[PDB]
Amino acid sequence: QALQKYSTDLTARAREGKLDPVIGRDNEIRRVVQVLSRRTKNNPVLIGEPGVGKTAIVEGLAQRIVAGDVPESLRDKTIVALDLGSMVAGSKYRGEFEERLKAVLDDIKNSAGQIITFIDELHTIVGAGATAMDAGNMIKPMLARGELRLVGATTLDEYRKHIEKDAALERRFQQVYVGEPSVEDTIGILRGLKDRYEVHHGVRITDSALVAAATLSDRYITARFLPDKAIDLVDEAASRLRMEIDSRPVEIDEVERLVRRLEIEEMALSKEEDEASAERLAKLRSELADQKEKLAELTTRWQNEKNAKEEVGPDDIADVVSAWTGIPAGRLLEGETAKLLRMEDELGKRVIGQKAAVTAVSDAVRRSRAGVSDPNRPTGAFMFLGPTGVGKTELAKALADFLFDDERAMVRIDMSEYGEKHTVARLIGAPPGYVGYEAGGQLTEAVRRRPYTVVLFDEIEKAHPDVFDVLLQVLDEGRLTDGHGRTVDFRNTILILTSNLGSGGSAEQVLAAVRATFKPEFINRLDDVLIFEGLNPEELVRIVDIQLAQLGKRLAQRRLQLQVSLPAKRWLAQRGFDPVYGARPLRRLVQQAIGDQLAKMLLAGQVHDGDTVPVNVSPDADSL
Amino acid sequence: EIEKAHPDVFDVLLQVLDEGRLTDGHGRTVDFRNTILILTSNLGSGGSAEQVLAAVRATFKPEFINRLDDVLIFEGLNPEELVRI
Numbered sequence: 068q069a070l071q072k073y074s075t076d077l078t079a080r081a082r083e084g085k086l087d088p089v090i091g092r093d094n095e096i097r098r099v100v101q102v103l104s105r106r107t108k109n110n111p112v113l114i115g116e117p118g119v120g121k122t123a124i125v126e127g128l129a130q131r132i133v134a135g136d137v138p139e140s141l142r143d144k145t146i147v148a149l150d151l152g153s154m155v156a157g158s159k160y161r162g163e164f165e166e167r168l169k170a171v172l173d174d175i176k177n178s179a180g181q182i183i184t185f186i187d188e189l190h191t192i193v194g195a196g197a198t199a200m201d202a203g204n205m206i207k208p209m210l211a212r213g214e215l216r217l218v219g220a221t222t223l224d225e226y227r228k229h230i231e232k233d234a235a236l237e238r239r240f241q242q243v244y245v246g247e248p249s250v251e252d253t254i255g256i257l258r259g260l261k262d263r264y265e266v267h268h269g270v271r272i273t274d275s276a277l278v279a280a281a282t283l284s285d286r287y288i289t290a291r292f293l294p295d296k297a298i299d300l301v302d303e304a305a306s307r308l309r310m311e312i313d314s315r316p317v318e319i320d321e322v323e324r325l326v327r328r329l330e331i332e333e334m335a336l337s338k339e340e341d342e343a344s345a346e347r348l349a350k351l352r353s354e355l356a357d358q359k360e361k362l363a364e365l366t367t368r369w370q371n372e373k374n375a376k377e378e379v380g381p382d383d384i385a386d387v388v389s390a391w392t393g394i395p396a397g398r399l400l401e402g403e404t405a406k407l408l409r410m411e412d413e414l415g416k417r418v419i420g421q422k423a424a425v426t427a428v429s430d431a432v433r434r435s436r437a438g439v440s441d442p443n444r445p446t447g448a449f450m451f452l453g454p455t456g457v458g459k460t461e462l463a464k465a466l467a468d469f470l471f472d473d474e475r476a477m478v479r480i481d482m483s484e485y486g487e488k489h490t491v492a493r494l495i496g497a498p499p500g501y502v503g504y505e506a507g508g509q510l511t512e513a514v515r516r517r518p519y520t521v522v523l524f525d526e527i528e529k530a531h532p533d534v535f536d537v538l539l540q541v542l543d544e545g546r547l548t549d550g551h552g553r554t555v556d557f558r559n560t561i562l563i564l565t566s567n568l569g570s571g572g573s574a575e576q577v578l579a580a581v582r583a584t585f586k587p588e589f590i591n592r593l594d595d596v597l598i599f600e601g602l603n604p605e606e607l608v609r610i611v612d613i614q615l616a617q618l619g620k621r622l623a624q625r626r627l628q629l630q631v632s633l634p635a636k637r638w639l640a641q642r643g644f645d646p647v648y649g650a651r652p653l654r655r656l657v658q659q660a661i662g663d664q665l666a667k668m669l670l671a672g673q674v675h676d677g678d679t680v681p682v683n684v685s686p687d688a689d690s691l
Numbered sequence: 692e693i694e695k696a697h698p699d700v701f702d703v704l705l706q707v708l709d710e711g712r713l714t715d716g717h718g719r720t721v722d723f724r725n726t727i728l729i730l731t732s733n734l735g736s737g738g739s740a741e742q743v744l745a746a747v748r749a750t751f752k753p754e755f756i757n758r759l760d761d762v763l764i765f766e767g768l769n770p771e772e773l774v775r776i
């Protein structure tokens with residue numbers, strides 16, 4: 068009767084129909100049974116990485132016993148699930164734990180070998196009751212004679228951290244290696260599990276959902292194992308769909324929540340006795356109106372759809388895989404097809420010229436959302452080089468902004484400090500046993516979180532010619548391994564290597580300097596090797612416009628603006644001389660010609676905030 | 692890409708070949724007598740057969756070349772065997 072108090076009954080629940088169906092894994096249950104019915108030392112231990120199904124096998128064995136598919140020796144055996152947590156509950160005295168253990172062992176032995184105990188995560192049995200080794204090995208005499216059977220299951224690396232350190236007890240256990248299944252098997256598993264979820268959430272599930280989940284959960288989420296990271300997607304999709312069968316769907320409930328906040332802000336900002344908050348209000352109202360338009364449009368379209376979405380499909384799974392591990396995995400639902408077709412002209416707002424290199428980046432971004440590029444290879448690996456001041460770093464910063472709306476979201480490393488060979492260790496970590504080890508790598512541990520960024524290697528030509536080799540595997544496929552032995556995936560980042568070889572020689576001399584500075588097997592990894600071009604006087608007026616736009620945007624903090632005459636706008640670009648320093652002289656000239664005079668006149672009255680100022684050319688300089 | 696490493700990891704591999712054993716910190720001897728050991732490389736880079744066979748000999752030691760089985764040499768791609776790739 069001690070059992071009734073210190074353990075539950077598994078076979079009883081299997082009869083009462085409370086365990087999930089178990090599909091496949093025939094070899095494993097066969098081996099478990101045949102080990103479980105031998106003469107001496109019959110103690111199978113299911114071992115293997117976490118998630119691949121190790122409790123599911125024991126539940127399958129229980130349902131199999133209830134059914135009758137077992138051999139003769141295992142008829143009516145009444146599996147029992149032990150519990151060592153509720154056994155050490157209150158035993159602060161000297162013998163209170165050994166007493167309970169002896170009672171349970173005696174009642175297991177009194178039965179005619181019927182009971183089949185089952186300790187889940189038996190790596191906790193080692194130090195059961197400590198004080199001096201006495202407890203947890205009182206069963207060691209009964210294991211050998213095979214009186215109690217004890218099918219248990221622990222993870223693969225808590226078996227050599229807790230048990231293998233006890234070689235006298237490992238001897239009494241037989242290991243059953245449970246390897247993870249493939250996609251074709253996971254699909255079959257899901258096809259039989261697609262009823263409990265479909266009934267718990269009042270929805271229906273298409274078979275395409277199962278297929279797409281079992282595929283995407285293997286392609287993207289490279290940190291868990293397969294029978295589980297595929298069930299999670301299905302489960303979350305179903306829960307979301309049931310949440311939307313409530314009153315309103317998403318994308319209407321978000322816009323109404325935004326509108327309410329904008330309203331409650333505009334209602335309480337109106338009574339502000341100020342003049343600078345007048346413009347800080349003049350935009351809030353416009354925003355509220357332009358959002359209420361969208362709300363009304365969505366609400367009307369819902370009415371049409373409802374007078375003229377009830378099962379999960381192969382794209383809601385993509386929405387989940389995008390919301391978790393923010394890699395975009397969708398199918399271009401018309402929100403951004405226009406954007407990806409406008410990409411070139413949109414990156415033109417910040418970068419000017421070098422269409423030969425803008426088109427090359429845009430094409431690599433584009434043919435990956437359409438699902439055409441190599442799924443196991445980086446999303447693109449370019450090294451664009453050319454003379455200075457031309458805009459290579461600028462294009463790399465414009466791309467990250469166009470993609471994530473925050474230029475500080477990309478991962479940037481400056482390869483000008485890696486001049487010494489030994490300085491490699493700061494991006495792959497330090498081996499075990501050395502000073503900085505628990506911190507892990509640095510590039511690795513940044514790409515391991517949010518693996519959608521853009522990676523930038525400035526001035527690649529200045530690092531020692533031995534950091535070039537840590538990038539071979541990184542460019543050819545997405546793998547790089549830190550100290551702890553974990554591996555990160557680069558398969559969906561966009562690498563970029565800005566350089567400066569062959570300052571202004573030719574488009575042929577620079578291709579003869581690259582081939583002498585790099586190795587034949589390293590150039591072979593790259594995509595197109597883009598070459599940038601010097602700037603023309605006609606490409607420079609637009610840069611003047613950009614600089615003035617930025618300066619005005621910065622000045623608008625103090626409520627100013629400038630009226631620049633076209634004579635001055637062309638004078639500035641006329642003084643952007645010397646196509647040997649690119650386009651920085653323009654910046655320093657704008658400073659030395661406008662910023663200093665503006666400061667002068669600004670911190671001495673006469674240009675008080677508010678009113679704008681005009682700028683006009685003079686004989687030589689330009690005055691205000 | 693084995694020739695890119697430091698010539699001490701070779702000496703670690705020295706007993707993996709020819710015996711299939713190496714023991715870690717915990718003092719557990721691990722056996723390799725059933726694996727298939729494969730080492731790629733890119734030495735020589737164009738030498739016919741003895742600009743490469745003598746560039747292996749000057750980067751590795753005889754006691755390391757001696758454990759190996761045949762040192763396979765790969766060959767460039769003819770125009771015919773690309774219409775199939």
Ligand SMILES: Nc1ncnc2c1ncn2[C@@H]1O[C@H](COP(=O)(O)OP(=O)(O)OP(O)(O)=S)[C@@H](O)[C@H]1O
Nearest residue numbers: 087088089090117118119120121122123256294295
């Ligand atoms: N062969 C299978 N048939 C049916 N369901 C399975 C199968 N393998 C795994 N599952 C399900 O996938 C999940 C796997 O969970 P478990 O296998 O119980 O966890 P585990 O594999 O024991 O890993 P730990 O170490 O116990 S956390 C559960 O939801 C199971 O129901």
Ligand SMILES: Nc1ncnc2c1ncn2[C@@H]1O[C@H](COP(=O)(O)OP(=O)(O)OP(O)(O)=S)[C@@H](O)[C@H]1O
Nearest residue numbers: 417418419420455456457458459460461567650651
């Ligand atoms: N085509 C361009 N379009 C817009 N701004 C440009 C362009 N070319 C240069 N600029 C400006 O020039 C600044 C400096 O150019 P960068 O590209 O940062 O220098 P670089 O191209 O990296 O050359 P090096 O070798 O790195 S010094 C940028 O911040 C821009 O403001």
